[PDB]
Write a protein that binds this ligand. Structure first.
Ligand SMILES: [Ca+2]
Ligand SMILES: [Ca+2]
Ligand SMILES: [Ca+2]
Ligand SMILES: [Ca+2]
Ligand SMILES: [Zn+2]
Length: 316
């Protein structure tokens, strides 16, 4: 909508207060005009019809319980946009400042969030397995990274290509969590998963087996469920990424860590220059090795650590 840019205030899913960019035109709308062609947050009103109604508020204050998922979806979309702009020189998910759209209050008791090819969608959770999923910055950045992948490598959502797709979203979801310095960790979804249980998460990059996900290619899932294990076999790639960044010994193979920033540069270059829709794990290794070579040299420690990491998880 056309109007005047301003700044409101509200509280997110976890009770924290934050300022959000809004637009005034009779109502105050969750429309951020400061980032690309805009960030727009919609109310799905517990229905499954999308996108719903652009979020409208009478006084530019968002402290109602109903408001919290919209505040965080709106705010964390902006943080993710800033990350890709400031760190990787990418303007929105298409590289041309495409508008970012999110709908909250999707359905009733829906324990998931997703990118649907055109926008982000967030359930509220059932209150036991999940609280509203936009409260997790790694969740939000995970979903928006699916849009980046769709517009770059185009990894198809099944088998090893799909597991790479999910791993990329976990990797940059975590890097965005570190970028915002919001209680950062190498876990996925810990802020919105099981509000009654402390210290757990949806999956772990540092130790995927902690939740029954493979940490080595010999333990990969080979069935047909989960589109061929896209959320399962991603643990193999997540572990390799964790090793590249932080280092460690895994199944007897030692990896010298090179840090998060270099991990992001290597995988972003692999994603945008070398991966294709049908890439498999072995091709991802070649892409990451070539990306590290482009950036740091064929004799560099960086290239060495990439090779060791994939060796450690059994990917040749
Ligand atoms: Ca209000
Ligand atoms: Ca965290
Ligand atoms: Ca996390
Ligand atoms: Ca929990
Ligand atoms: Zn995903």
């Amino acid at each position: 909508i056309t109007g005047t840019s301003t700044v409101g205030v509200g509280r997110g899913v976890l009770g924290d207060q934050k300022n959000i960019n809004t637009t005034y035109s009779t109502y105050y709308y969750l429309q951020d005009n400061t980032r690309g062609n805009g960030i727009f947050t919609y109310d799905a009103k517990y229905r499954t019809t999308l996108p719903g109604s652009l979020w409208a508020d009478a006084d530019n204050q968002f402290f109602a319980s109903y408001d919290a998922p919209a505040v965080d979806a709106h705010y964390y979309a902006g943080v993710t946009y800033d990350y890709y702009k400031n760190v990787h020189n990418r303007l929105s998910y298409d590289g041309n400042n495409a508008a970012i759209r999110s709908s909250v209050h999707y359905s009733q008791g829906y324990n998931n969030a997703f990118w649907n090819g055109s926008q982000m969608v967030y359930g509220d959770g059932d209150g036991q397995t999940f609280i509203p999923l936009s409260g997790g910055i790694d969740v939000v950045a995970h979903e928006l990274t699916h849009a980046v992948t769709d517009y770059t490598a185009g990894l198809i959502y099944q088998n090893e290509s799909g597991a790479i797709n999910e791993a990329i979203s976990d990797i940059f979801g975590t890097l965005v969590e570190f970028y915002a310095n919001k209680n950062p960790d190498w876990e996925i979804g810990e802020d919105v998963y099981t509000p009654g249980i402390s210290g757990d998460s949806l999956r772990s990059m540092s130790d995927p087996a902690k939740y029954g996900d493979p940490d080595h290619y010999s333990k990969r899932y080979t069935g047909t469920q989960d589109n061929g294990g896209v959320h399962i076999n991603s643990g193999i790639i997540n572990k390799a990424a964790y090793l590249i960044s932080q280092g460690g010994t895994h199944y007897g193979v030692s990896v010298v860590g090179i840090g998060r920033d270099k991990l992001g540069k290597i995988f972003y270059r692999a994603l945008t220059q070398y991966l294709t829709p049908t890439s498999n794990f072995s091709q991802l290794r070649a892409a990451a090795v070539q990306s590290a070579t482009d950036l740091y040299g064929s004799t560099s420690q960086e290239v060495a650590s990439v090779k060791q990491a994939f060796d450690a998880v059994g990917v040749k």
